[PDB]
Design a protein around this motif. Structure first.
Motif, PDB file in Angstrom:
ATOM      1  N   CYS B  38       5.537  72.599  83.409  1.00  0.00           N
ATOM      2  CA  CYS B  38       5.668  71.947  84.544  1.00  0.00           C
ATOM      3  C   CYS B  38       7.031  71.163  84.771  1.00  0.00           C
ATOM      4  CB  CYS B  38       4.332  71.210  84.656  1.00  0.00           C
ATOM      5  SG  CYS B  38       4.321  70.295  86.241  1.00  0.00           S
ATOM      6  N   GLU B  39       7.312  70.276  83.698  1.00  0.00           N
ATOM      7  CA  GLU B  39       8.493  69.676  83.618  1.00  0.00           C
ATOM      8  C   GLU B  39       9.548  70.817  84.092  1.00  0.00           C
ATOM      9  OE1 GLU B  39      10.053  68.713  79.719  1.00  0.00           O
ATOM     10  OE2 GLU B  39      10.951  66.807  80.626  1.00  0.00           O
ATOM     11  N   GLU B  40       9.945  71.743  83.358  1.00  0.00           N
ATOM     12  CA  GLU B  40      10.965  73.026  83.692  1.00  0.00           C
ATOM     13  C   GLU B  40      10.771  73.358  85.148  1.00  0.00           C
ATOM     14  OE1 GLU B  40      10.019  75.480  80.361  1.00  0.00           O
ATOM     15  OE2 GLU B  40      11.122  74.423  78.904  1.00  0.00           O
ATOM     16  N   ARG B  41       9.662  73.746  85.460  1.00  0.00           N
ATOM     17  CA  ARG B  41       9.535  74.152  86.935  1.00  0.00           C
ATOM     18  C   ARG B  41       9.961  73.003  87.772  1.00  0.00           C
ATOM     19  NH1 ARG B  41       3.433  74.380  87.228  1.00  0.00           N
ATOM     20  NH2 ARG B  41       3.474  72.678  88.977  1.00  0.00           N
ATOM     21  N   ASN B  42       9.827  71.751  87.570  1.00  0.00           N
ATOM     22  CA  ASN B  42      10.428  70.759  88.602  1.00  0.00           C
ATOM     23  C   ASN B  42      12.013  70.570  88.130  1.00  0.00           C
ATOM     24  OD1 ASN B  42       7.947  70.377  89.585  1.00  0.00           O
ATOM     25  ND2 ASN B  42       7.350  68.426  88.035  1.00  0.00           N
ATOM     26  N   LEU B  43      12.503  70.826  86.908  1.00  0.00           N
ATOM     27  CA  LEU B  43      13.861  70.997  86.940  1.00  0.00           C
ATOM     28  C   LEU B  43      14.720  71.720  87.569  1.00  0.00           C
ATOM     29  CD1 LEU B  43      14.280  70.596  83.011  1.00  0.00           C
ATOM     30  CD2 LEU B  43      14.751  68.583  84.653  1.00  0.00           C
ATOM     31  N   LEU B  44      14.056  72.997  87.614  1.00  0.00           N
ATOM     32  CA  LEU B  44      14.486  74.017  88.658  1.00  0.00           C
ATOM     33  C   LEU B  44      14.484  73.586  89.833  1.00  0.00           C
ATOM     34  CD1 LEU B  44      15.247  77.373  88.968  1.00  0.00           C
ATOM     35  CD2 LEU B  44      12.931  77.708  89.142  1.00  0.00           C
ATOM     36  N   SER B  45      13.273  73.102  90.515  1.00  0.00           N
ATOM     37  CA  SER B  45      13.135  72.825  91.731  1.00  0.00           C
ATOM     38  C   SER B  45      14.248  71.893  92.188  1.00  0.00           C
ATOM     39  CB  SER B  45      11.623  72.523  92.125  1.00  0.00           C
ATOM     40  OG  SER B  45      11.643  72.318  93.522  1.00  0.00           O
ATOM     41  N   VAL B  46      14.292  70.727  91.510  1.00  0.00           N
ATOM     42  CA  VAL B  46      15.151  69.489  91.698  1.00  0.00           C
ATOM     43  C   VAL B  46      16.369  70.041  91.809  1.00  0.00           C
ATOM     44  CG1 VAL B  46      16.078  67.215  90.834  1.00  0.00           C
ATOM     45  CG2 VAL B  46      13.629  67.942  90.759  1.00  0.00           C
ATOM     46  N   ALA B  47      16.778  70.930  90.952  1.00  0.00           N
ATOM     47  CA  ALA B  47      18.315  71.208  90.788  1.00  0.00           C
ATOM     48  C   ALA B  47      18.816  72.035  92.258  1.00  0.00           C
ATOM     49  CB  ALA B  47      18.427  72.165  89.889  1.00  0.00           C
ATOM     50  N   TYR B  48      18.260  73.060  92.454  1.00  0.00           N
ATOM     51  CA  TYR B  48      18.495  74.087  93.682  1.00  0.00           C
ATOM     52  C   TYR B  48      17.981  73.224  95.064  1.00  0.00           C
ATOM     53  CZ  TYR B  48      19.628  77.981  90.766  1.00  0.00           C
ATOM     54  OH  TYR B  48      20.079  79.103  90.105  1.00  0.00           O
ATOM     55  N   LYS B  49      17.076  72.384  95.055  1.00  0.00           N
ATOM     56  CA  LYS B  49      16.878  71.668  96.498  1.00  0.00           C
ATOM     57  C   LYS B  49      17.899  70.713  96.500  1.00  0.00           C
ATOM     58  CE  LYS B  49      14.023  69.880  99.567  1.00  0.00           C
ATOM     59  NZ  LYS B  49      14.066  70.718 100.809  1.00  0.00           N
TER      60      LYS B  49
END
Ligand SMILES: *SCCNC(=O)C1CCN(C(=O)C(C)(C)Oc2ccc(Cl)cc2)CC1
Ligand SMILES: *SCCNC(=O)C1CCN(C(=O)C(C)(C)Oc2ccc(Cl)cc2)CC1
Lengths: 8, 231, 231, 8
Positions: B38-49
């Motif tokens: 979940c943490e990593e999913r959010n890293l991915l999303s935060v970065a590209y967003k």
């Protein structure tokens, strides 16, 4: 410009 | 690089507010082909967003100047605005295509749980929606069909697997309602979805802890704010 | 491209918050070898200050993590933080070197008026100061000597040509005082310069219009805020 | 982190 889901 | 080093560098880039670097690190981590936490999913999303968000903001500024100059701004206009808008547009399409590639090459297929599947299908709808904001011609039609199909699959899963106040389910419905209003020009469907989503979640708020309530109502307020604008 | 198109695109990039693009456009405009207007001077400064400012912020975050991990953070540390700090550092040095190249190849020599000369020599001191923040060894000594020499020439000119409440003269003195305190480890000189600058400008504030006063006191307040921290 | 000249 509607509001979409915030990103946290 | 080893996956663990890529994740570490993504987290450093996040603290450093280096979101392009952060996205590149997470891209490399995804390409290892293992699921994300979940943490990593959010890293991915935060970065590209963050990356696409700056490009979207720039595109809207430039596109607006370009239109107000195609509105009789005659002799106050060479090709500069159009050329620069096109440049930003191509860059935005590239980033969206990169995210979608990660989603279709790895993330959606490899997801071992329904919540992750919903999260990634929502992301797929979102990045197609961003592409649709700038698209023309046949590209636009294809993109809109793809956004709808991803959002709808996410919606089906979320109604089966998540309670109506779940923040991911709520944010998905919110973004699908924005797709209806702004992209598909189906404001009946948009207002219907936003109101139904709000009503079915309201019904459950009295069972929620302080912390659950805060997450859920953050999203419900945006549904309310859109209904204001749209009605 | 023609100079006028580069300026137009710089202004578009500014509205779009695309500061890397903005800086590249202004670099091309400068390289035409004509002087910059006050407006254009500020476009150049805004663009590069935003770019280097993000790199500086990132470098400070990373350097701090690196030190707190060289403080017995043993086994909580591979090379990732150091490698990433070095990457950001090299990128920052490149941007500073680019600005300094514009200043030494074109802007300082070509400036036809004292106010412009002061503005550019202050910029030269500032970007050497940013280099000094990350420098080591012989590089650091050279850089510090160069920053001091640029700031001092700017100071001499400004005392001859500008009133003591002039915002450019004030901002120069402010930044030279920061150089003394943070870079040269000469806090006596820093506190002396900041207090003398404030006192000599205070003395004139009663002659200033509403608009002049706002510009001048913005800078004087920062002198006051630094004196707090430094005393 | 001292304050330096703002950039407008
Ligand atoms: S792995 C970290 C914990 N897991 C989570 O799913 C998140 C719960 C809620 N959250 C959020 O930032 C908000 C409130 C914005 O809810 C979301 C709505 C929609 C999406 Cl796609 C994501 C979050 C933090 C962590
Ligand atoms: S060409 C636009 C007008 N010319 C000017 O010099 C500026 C006057 C003051 N200003 C500023 O933003 C502040 C208040 C920050 O003063 C400065 C101090 C130091 C420097 Cl290097 C620059 C400005 C706006 C325009």
């Amino acid at each position: 410009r509607s509001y979409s889901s915030p990103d946290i | 690089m080893e996956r663990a080093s890529l994740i570490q560098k993504a987290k450093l880039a996040e603290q450093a507010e280096r979101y392009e670097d952060m996205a590149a690190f997470m891209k490399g981590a995804v390409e290892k082909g293992e699921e994300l936490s979940c943490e990593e999913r959010n890293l991915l999303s935060v970065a590209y967003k963050n990356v696409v968000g700056g490009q979207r903001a720039a595109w809207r500024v430039l596109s607006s100047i370009e239109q107000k100059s195609n509105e009789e701004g005659s002799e106050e206009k060479g090709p500069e605005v159009r050329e620069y808008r096109e440049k930003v547009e191509t860059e935005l399409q590239g980033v969206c295509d990169t995210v979608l590639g990660l989603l279709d090459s790895h993330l959606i297929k490899e997801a071992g749980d329904a919540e992750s599947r919903v999260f990634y299908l929502k992301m797929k709808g979102d990045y197609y929606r961003y592409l649709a904001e700038v698209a023309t011609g046949d590209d636009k039609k294809r993109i809109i069909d793809s956004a709808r199909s991803a959002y709808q699959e996410a919606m089906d899963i979320s109604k089966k697997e998540m309670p109506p106040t779940n923040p991911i389910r709520l944010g998905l419905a919110l973004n699908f309602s924005v797709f209806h209003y702004e992209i598909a020009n189906s404001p009946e469907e948009a207002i219907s979805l936003a109101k139904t989503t709000f009503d079915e979640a309201m019904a459950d708020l009295h069972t929620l802890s302080e912390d659950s309530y805060k997450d859920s109502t953050l999203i419900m307020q945006l549904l309310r704010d859109n209904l204001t604008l749209w009605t």
